[PDB]
Amino acid sequence: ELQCIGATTLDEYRKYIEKDAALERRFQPIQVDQPSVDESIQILQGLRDRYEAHHRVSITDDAIEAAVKLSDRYISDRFLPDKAIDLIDEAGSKVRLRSF
Amino acid sequence: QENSEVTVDDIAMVVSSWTGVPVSKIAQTETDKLLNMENILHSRVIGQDEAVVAVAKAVRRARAGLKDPKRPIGSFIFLGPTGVGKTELARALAESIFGDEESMIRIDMSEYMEKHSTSRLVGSPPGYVGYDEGGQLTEKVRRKPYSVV
Amino acid sequence: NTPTLDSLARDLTAIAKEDSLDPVIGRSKEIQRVIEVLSRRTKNNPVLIGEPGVGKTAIAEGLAQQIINNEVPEILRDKRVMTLDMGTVGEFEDRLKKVMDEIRQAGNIILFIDALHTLIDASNILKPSLARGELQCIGATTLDEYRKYIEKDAALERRFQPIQVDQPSVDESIQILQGLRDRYEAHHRVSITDDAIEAAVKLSDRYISDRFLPDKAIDLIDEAGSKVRLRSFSEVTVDDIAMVVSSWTGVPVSKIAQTETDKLLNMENILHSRVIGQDEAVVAVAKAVRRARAGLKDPKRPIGSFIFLGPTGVGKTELARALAESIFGDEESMIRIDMSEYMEKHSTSRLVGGQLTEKVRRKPYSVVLLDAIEKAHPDVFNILLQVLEDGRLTDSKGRTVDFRNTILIMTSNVGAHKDMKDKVMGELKRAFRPEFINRIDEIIVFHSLEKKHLTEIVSLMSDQLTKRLKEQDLSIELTDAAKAKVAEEGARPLRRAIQKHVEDRLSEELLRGNIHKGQHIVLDVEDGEFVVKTTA
Amino acid sequence: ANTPTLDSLARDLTAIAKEDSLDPVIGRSKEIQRVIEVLSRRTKNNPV
Ligand SMILES: Nc1ncnc2c1ncn2[C@@H]1O[C@H](COP(=O)(O)OP(=O)(O)OP(=O)(O)O)[C@@H](O)[C@H]1O
Ligand SMILES: Nc1ncnc2c1ncn2[C@@H]1O[C@H](COP(=O)(O)OP(=O)(O)O)[C@@H](O)[C@H]1O
Numbered sequence A: 001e002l003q004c005i006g007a008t009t010l011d012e013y014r015k016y017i018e019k020d021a022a023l024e025r026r027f028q029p030i031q032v033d034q035p036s037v038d039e040s041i042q043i044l045q046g047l048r049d050r051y052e053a054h055h056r057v058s059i060t061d062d063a064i065e066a067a068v069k070l071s072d073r074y075i076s077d078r079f080l081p082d083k084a085i086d087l088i089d090e091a092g093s094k095v096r097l098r099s100f
Numbered sequence B: 001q002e003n004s005e006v007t008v009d010d011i012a013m014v015v016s017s018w019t020g021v022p023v024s025k026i027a028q029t030e031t032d033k034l035l036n037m038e039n040i041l042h043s044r045v046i047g048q049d050e051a052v053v054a055v056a057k058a059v060r061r062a063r064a065g066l067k068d069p070k071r072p073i074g075s076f077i078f079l080g081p082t083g084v085g086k087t088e089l090a091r092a093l094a095e096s097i098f099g100d101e102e103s104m105i106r107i108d109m110s111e112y113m114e115k116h117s118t119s120r121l122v123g124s125p126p127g128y129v130g131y132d133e134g135g136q137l138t139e140k141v142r143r144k145p146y147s148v149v
Numbered sequence C: 001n002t003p004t005l006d007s008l009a010r011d012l013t014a015i016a017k018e019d020s021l022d023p024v025i026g027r028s029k030e031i032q033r034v035i036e037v038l039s040r041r042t043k044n045n046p047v048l049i050g051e052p053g054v055g056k057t058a059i060a061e062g063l064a065q066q067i068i069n070n071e072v073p074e075i076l077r078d079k080r081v082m083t084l085d086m087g088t089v090g091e092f093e094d095r096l097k098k099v100m101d102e103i104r105q106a107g108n109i110i111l112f113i114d115a116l117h118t119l120i121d122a123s124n125i126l127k128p129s130l131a132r133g134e135l136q137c138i139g140a141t142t143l144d145e146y147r148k149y150i151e152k153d154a155a156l157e158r159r160f161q162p163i164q165v166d167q168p169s170v171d172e173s174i175q176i177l178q179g180l181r182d183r184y185e186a187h188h189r190v191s192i193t194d195d196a197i198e199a200a201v202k203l204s205d206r207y208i209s210d211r212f213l214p215d216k217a218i219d220l221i222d223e224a225g226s227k228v229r230l231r232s233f234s235e236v237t238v239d240d241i242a243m244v245v246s247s248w249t250g251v252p253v254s255k256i257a258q259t260e261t262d263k264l265l266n267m268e269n270i271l272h273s274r275v276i277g278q279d280e281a282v283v284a285v286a287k288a289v290r291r292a293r294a295g296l297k298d299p300k301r302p303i304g305s306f307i308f309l310g311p312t313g314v315g316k317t318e319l320a321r322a323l324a325e326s327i328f329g330d331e332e333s334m335i336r337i338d339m340s341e342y343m344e345k346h347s348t349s350r351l352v353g354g355q356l357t358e359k360v361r362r363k364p365y366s367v368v369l370l371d372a373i374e375k376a377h378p379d380v381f382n383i384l385l386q387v388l389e390d391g392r393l394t395d396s397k398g399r400t401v402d403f404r405n406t407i408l409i410m411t412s413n414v415g416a417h418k419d420m421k422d423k424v425m426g427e428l429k430r431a432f433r434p435e436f437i438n439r440i441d442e443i444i445v446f447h448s449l450e451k452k453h454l455t456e457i458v459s460l461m462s463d464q465l466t467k468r469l470k471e472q473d474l475s476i477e478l479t480d481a482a483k484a485k486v487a488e489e490g491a492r493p494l495r496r497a498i499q500k501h502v503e504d505r506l507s508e509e510l511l512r513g514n515i516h517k518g519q520h521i522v523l524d525v526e527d528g529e530f531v532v533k534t535t536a
Numbered sequence D: 001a002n003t004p005t006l007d008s009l010a011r012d013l014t015a016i017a018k019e020d021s022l023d024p025v026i027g028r029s030k031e032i033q034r035v036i037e038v039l040s041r042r043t044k045n046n047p048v
Helices: A010-020 A038-053 A059-074 A082-098 B008-018 B033-044 B049-063 B086-095 B118-124 B136-145 C001-007 C012-018 C028-039 C056-067 C092-106 C121-131 C144-152 C173-186 C192-207 C215-232 C238-249 C253-260 C263-272 C279-294 C314-326 C356-362 C378-390 C417-431 C434-438 C452-471 C480-487 C497-513 D012-016 D027-038
Strands: C046-051 C111-114 C137-141 C161-162 C306-311 C334-338 C365-369 C408-411 C442-445 C476-477 C522-527 C528-534
Touching: A038 A059, A038 A082, A038 C137, A059 A082, A059 C476, A082 C306, A082 C476, B033 B049, B033 B086, B033 C497, B049 B086, B049 C497, B118 C056, B118 C452, C001 C092, C001 C528, C012 C056, C012 D012, C028 C056, C028 C161, C056 C111, C056 C137, C092 C121, C111 C144, C121 C408, C137 C144, C173 C192, C173 C215, C192 C238, C215 C238, C215 D027, C238 C253, C238 D027, C279 C314, C279 C442, C314 C334, C314 C408, C334 C356, C356 C365, C378 C408, C378 C434, C378 C442, C417 C434, C417 C442, C452 C480, C452 C497, C476 C480, C480 C497, C497 C522, C497 C528
Parallel strands: C046 C137, C046 C161, C111 C137, C306 C408, C306 C442, C334 C365, C365 C408, C476 C522
Antiparallel strands: C522 C528
């Protein structure tokens, strides 16, 4: 009767929902995989628009490619594209501060 | 009309989406691939012609609708000298099967030398510390059932 | 002061006034034991240990009955047996302390407690009131929960007392029911024939195994006495009981019915034609089980030992499974214990345990197979030897597990004709003690492993490959010329070659289009070589 | 009889099956008949 959309991490799933075994049955799982490098680049551009508008700087395309690939390589403790946009916003704040 | 034809293909699609395993009617860009998979491997891994033959054979039979058993797709023991490909072949295979070869389940069994480390393949018994995050291997297969352990 | 504690729970003598409860059948010795312990002054208040549904509370009820009568001696005379309603009683402590005041008022209130472990909340004033005294009560728990209790031995072992209460005999249960069949037949306005009662007991002790006597049989009687009633809107019989058991467990009523003394005829046919080869072997074992099971012999032991000898990997496990299906069915009666894992003299620890003990605990109606027994050790060997003596193993709790209708079949390779007929005993008496041999039921030995029989197996295997396709979809047929081409193969695992020649080749050729679904795929040797065609 | 004090609070299956909303159950005649029997019993009346 009521349409729902749930969202848990794998960890909470195994630990909590899987434990229930009845409510789990009610819902329908859908795996969302981390984007590859290229998909991450496109996501990063779409968001680059807003991040530019908020920091008031302009983020190069190759800047974003480097953010994606670097953060794929030298962070390896959290996932994309959260990593990449975190770097992008870091850099934006850093540059705006560098304006002062 | 024609659209009122929920057929085997559509159940196959909702399965292969639900569980990661690819049960459906394979098409071009796949059959050509599965046939040429021997050549893909023998590109990535040089020499060692015999192995890639048997691995490609098993992947094909499994993917061709054969492999009636409820037992796993394949089971190989690669022996030989060092620096020959016993790991490179598996990396090539997981890469050609999926891409990036990073979906491959890699378990360095050289780490489970102890008697009790056998815990972290199956988890830690209920109640005991680490019970929730259990299954260094099992959770990896329940995450992605169609992979190369 | 009756008001408060009667508001706590109803008295048993109140029921015994008109004796609403059925008079319990037998248990007179056990009730006498209860009277003994209640007569004592140090450890007077007992606790009845037994499985659920065995009728432990029935013993307390019959006790209240013998209390109303004069069977009870004088010191225990004038004693009201009550119980406890935890529901009907911030304030529950006040009411319970009031109950304790009334216990102090009249020292003639033998209380009763079911599920005593989960009760001692109330312990806060019960366990103290036990120490002071005059709370003489009775306890009804299980065994393991009694262990959980005695783990409070500090203040509770001194006072309590164990009274093991166990299943009535499969015979005794008949008189139990015959005594109490009256009440239900009155309730449902039917009548219960005594053959129906004995049949219900004989199907309860065998085909359900989940619960215990007499609970099993009483439940069956009541389910029949309601089914027949609803069928009318008269007399219940074996037919209804077989039907309700079939509804319970899910086995077919026919298999419940006919297989008592005629399945033994079909068994030898099944053995003779379920595995290929081992001709004299099926003759041997078939003769054997007819000697034991059909025969009036070996009442204490199980069906008996069958040490399978010869080359491992020729049909031993398959003969075992075929026999399992034969005598008991389901292909699930066979339990396997890989004695190669027991290559350690401590491994018996996991027996004393997630091993054969739990397996026979779950179903005492089954087959058991021990493979690579040679890999065992003299300690686990002595274990299985005293088992084969009586089946009674006792692991992790002293559980006197019974081996009633189990099969003990050991498998190994000491061989590895008449010269072999001698060497087998040679390496038996030379590899372990002769007494274990002397606990023989029969010894099954097959030496030859290669014959035309082998080719037949391959045919069977080909059939299996066709089966799974008729399952999903295909129409494979292996022409016997191709079957012989494959079979012309040394080593036994020819299915691998089947896979190679047929399954692979066909999959490669099907992937590229030379085959499509819904086609009669004949594989044949036309020139001395595999040829595929489709007929649809 | 005819008490609106509970249907106000519970959900009546049968009154729903009046207007035929519940999806039909196929098979399970054995289990339904067993619920019926147990429902007509004195030792253990309540089914679970
Ligand atoms: N036949 C081959 N073709 C191409 N590269 C190879 C081959 N054999 C080994 N290599 C190279 O060896 C490296 C990895 O070899 P691999 O790890 O498979 O050897 P290995 O047998 O796993 O070694 P180890 O004995 O330490 O397990 C890669 O650089 C790979 O290019
Ligand atoms: N010896 C017996 N004579 C008559 N009835 C018995 C006997 N043993 C068990 N019963 C029956 O068992 C039923 C209840 O068993 P109960 O004592 O409640 O099981 P548990 O001991 O697990 O609580 C009663 O209907 C009782 O008549």
